[PDB]
Amino acid sequence: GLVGLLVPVYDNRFFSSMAQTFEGQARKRGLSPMVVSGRRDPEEERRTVETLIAYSIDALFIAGVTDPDGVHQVCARAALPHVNIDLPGKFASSVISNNRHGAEILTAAILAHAAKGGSLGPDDVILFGGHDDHASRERIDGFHAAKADYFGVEGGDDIEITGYSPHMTEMAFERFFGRRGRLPRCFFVNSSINFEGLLRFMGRHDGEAFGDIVVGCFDYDPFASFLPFPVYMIKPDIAQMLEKGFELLEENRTEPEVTIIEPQLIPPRTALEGPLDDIWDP
Amino acid sequence: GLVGLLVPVYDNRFFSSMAQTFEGQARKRGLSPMVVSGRRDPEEERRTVETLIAYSIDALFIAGVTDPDGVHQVCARAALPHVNIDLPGKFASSVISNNRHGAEILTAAILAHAAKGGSLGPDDVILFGGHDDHASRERIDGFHAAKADYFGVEGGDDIEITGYSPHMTEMAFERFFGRRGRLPRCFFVNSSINFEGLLRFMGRHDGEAFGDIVVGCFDYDPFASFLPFPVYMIKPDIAQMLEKGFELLEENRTEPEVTIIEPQLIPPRTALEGPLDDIWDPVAL
Ligand SMILES: OC[C@@]1(O)OC[C@@H](O)[C@@H](O)[C@H]1O
Numbered sequence: 001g002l003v004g005l006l007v008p009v010y011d012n013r014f015f016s017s018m019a020q021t022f023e024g025q026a027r028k029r030g031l032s033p034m035v036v037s038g039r040r041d042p043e044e045e046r047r048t049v050e051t052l053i054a055y056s057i058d059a060l061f062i063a064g065v066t067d068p069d070g071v072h073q074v075c076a077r078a079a080l081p082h083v084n085i086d087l088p089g090k091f092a093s094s095v096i097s098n099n100r101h102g103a104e105i106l107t108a109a110i111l112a113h114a115a116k117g118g119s120l121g122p123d124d125v126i127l128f129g130g131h132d133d134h135a136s137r138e139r140i141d142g143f144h145a146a147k148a149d150y151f152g153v154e155g156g157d158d159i160e161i162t163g164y165s166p167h168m169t170e171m172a173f174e175r176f177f178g179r180r181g182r183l184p185r186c187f188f189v190n191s192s193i194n195f196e197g198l199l200r201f202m203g204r205h206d207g208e209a210f211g212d213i214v215v216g217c218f219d220y221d222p223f224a225s226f227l228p229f230p231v232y233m234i235k236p237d238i239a240q241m242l243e244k245g246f247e248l249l250e251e252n253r254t255e256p257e258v259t260i261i262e263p264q265l266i267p268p269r270t271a272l273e274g275p276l277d278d279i280w281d282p
Numbered sequence: 283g284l285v286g287l288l289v290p291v292y293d294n295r296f297f298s299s300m301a302q303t304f305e306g307q308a309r310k311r312g313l314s315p316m317v318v319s320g321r322r323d324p325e326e327e328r329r330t331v332e333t334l335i336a337y338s339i340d341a342l343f344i345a346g347v348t349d350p351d352g353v354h355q356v357c358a359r360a361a362l363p364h365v366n367i368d369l370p371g372k373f374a375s376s377v378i379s380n381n382r383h384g385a386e387i388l389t390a391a392i393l394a395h396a397a398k399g400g401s402l403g404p405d406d407v408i409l410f411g412g413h414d415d416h417a418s419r420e421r422i423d424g425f426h427a428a429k430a431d432y433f434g435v436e437g438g439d440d441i442e443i444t445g446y447s448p449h450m451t452e453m454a455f456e457r458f459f460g461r462r463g464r465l466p467r468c469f470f471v472n473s474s475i476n477f478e479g480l481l482r483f484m485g486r487h488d489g490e491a492f493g494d495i496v497v498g499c500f501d502y503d504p505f506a507s508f509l510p511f512p513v514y515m516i517k518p519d520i521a522q523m524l525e526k527g528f529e530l531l532e533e534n535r536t537e538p539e540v541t542i543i544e545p546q547l548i549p550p551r552t553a554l555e556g557p558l559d560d561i562w563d564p565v566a567l
């Protein structure tokens with residue numbers, strides 16, 4: 001009963017939390033859980049799945065792959081049950097978080113917090129992110145939706161196109177800080193990995209107070225929650241996503257179904273109880 | 283060429299970065315890397331490897347397991363190449379960090395930083411953590427060595443014994459906050475997993491002043507580095523540990539050898555490059 005979870009990286013705070021949740025859920029099913037990395041490379045993702053098929057894994061969870069179709073064909077040729085997690089696929093059923101709604105409540109929350117510091121203008125509210133993923137594009141849509149309702153206007157240049165990688169995000173923060181002289185008063189970071197780019201930027205500018213900023217991040221991390229600026233985070237319901245990923249694998253419907261799970265807004269300085277219960281007891 | 287890394291949990295920041303480093307090195311070796319968790323339970327650790335053996339895994343990295351010897355006996359029956367990482371085992375080769383020395387330099391750094399705010403007394407310097415773990419005992423020893431050298435005295439009553447668990451650590455900070463009315467000016471947190479307990483404690487006491495603190499944590503995380511209070515972190519050279527872990531897998535020498543890798547002290551507000559390079563550049567399909 002070997003079941004595999006395919007993730008882009010182990011180092012990611014969201015995917016690392018998913019792997020912990022996945023292992024426990026698989027353990028309760030009596031399955032044996034293994035995690036493999038696709039390294040966000042379609043060829044690597046295909047080779048990794050082929051290796052898992054060669055080693056006779058029973059089921060695969062496909063989480064955050066850049067190419068869902070190529071992975072599906074490999075699983076289909078091997079007749080290996082697979083469900084998409086987090087990022088949708090057309091051929092197989094997908095369980096994903098409600099990125100648009102999560103971004104909307106996140107943007108509304110950081111807008112309300114920043115406004116307590118002083119009235120805002122649309123040029124004050126910026127998103128660092130990208131169009132490469134359905135989740136990322138959905139996040140910009142929720143972000144624009146909350147801004148449009150708040151300001152009553154839309155269509156400003158509020159998107160700083162940054163790559164999921166922190167280095168491109170760091171350069172964006174460096175570039176923005178260069179013309180404006182400050183960080184935006186209210187800004188949205190697309191991912192926890194993007195958030196690392198902000199820290200790289202901040203480390204380069206020791207001696208800057210960065211006191212006027214309010215930040216909203218997709219993905220949750222207790223350490224990021226307690227950062228010296230107020231940080232609002234969206235925590236996806238990974239457990240429900242995996243629970244639906246399971247049971248969807250049991251079920252034989254050929255028709256692909258996309259199931260959307262509502263995320264939860266996390267206020268600043270919140271340290272939540274984690275998936276590891278009594279694992280770290282002596 | 284399936285090569286496995288066995289970790290206690292996926293969620294831990296040290297083990298998650300280790301899995302990232304392990305994935306890259308294994309890929310360069312032309313191996314196929316996969317990670318499994320032992321949940322710090324000896325029976326599940328052994329049962330997990332037994333299953334990997336049944337599926338004919340080629341090599342295994344044993345990282346932070348509660349029962350290194352029992353895992354070794356399981357590997358030995360299958361003649362499966364294995365090296366212990368981070369936590370030593372007597373029967374198989376181990377690559378471990380220099381926990382005692384890293385703890386010593388960590389304590390010296392936070393002592394120096396805390397002292398710059400005001401003279402210290404030995405009761406101001408506390409450690410939250412400690413475990414039957416070899417790393418934990420070595421860390422407590424390095425902590426005591428640095429305190430004794432600084433103060434010129436020892437036998438202070440400065441170790442708050444907690445499991446790795448955040449909840450027990452949170453209770454430890456809570457009890458300390460009850461007696462003192464504040465957090466200690468200088469304290470050492472054994473693990474990044476313990477560190478969550480400190481955040482849980484702070485979250486429980488919103489609007490309450492904890493006092494001015496300097497914190498040293500073993501293990502490194504960029505977010506934890508940038509916490510509003512100064513956090514000094516020890517970063518183990520995970521890349522070297524795994525490189526030494528490989529090739530130790532290649533060698534057929536029966537004799538167990540423990541290789542000690544020096545960790546690096548990280549000052550507050552430091553963001554590293556990490557083990558992920560180019561992975562997050564856009565694919566555009
Ligand atoms: O940090 C995790 C992340 O960047 O991964 C890629 C996206 O699918 C989404 O899960 C996002 O949260």
Ligand SMILES: OC[C@@]1(O)OC[C@@H](O)[C@@H](O)[C@H]1O
Nearest residue numbers: 296346368417473474475501
């Ligand atoms: O979180 C990692 C850690 O705290 O766990 C206990 C030890 O294995 C040691 O590696 C230490 O780094």
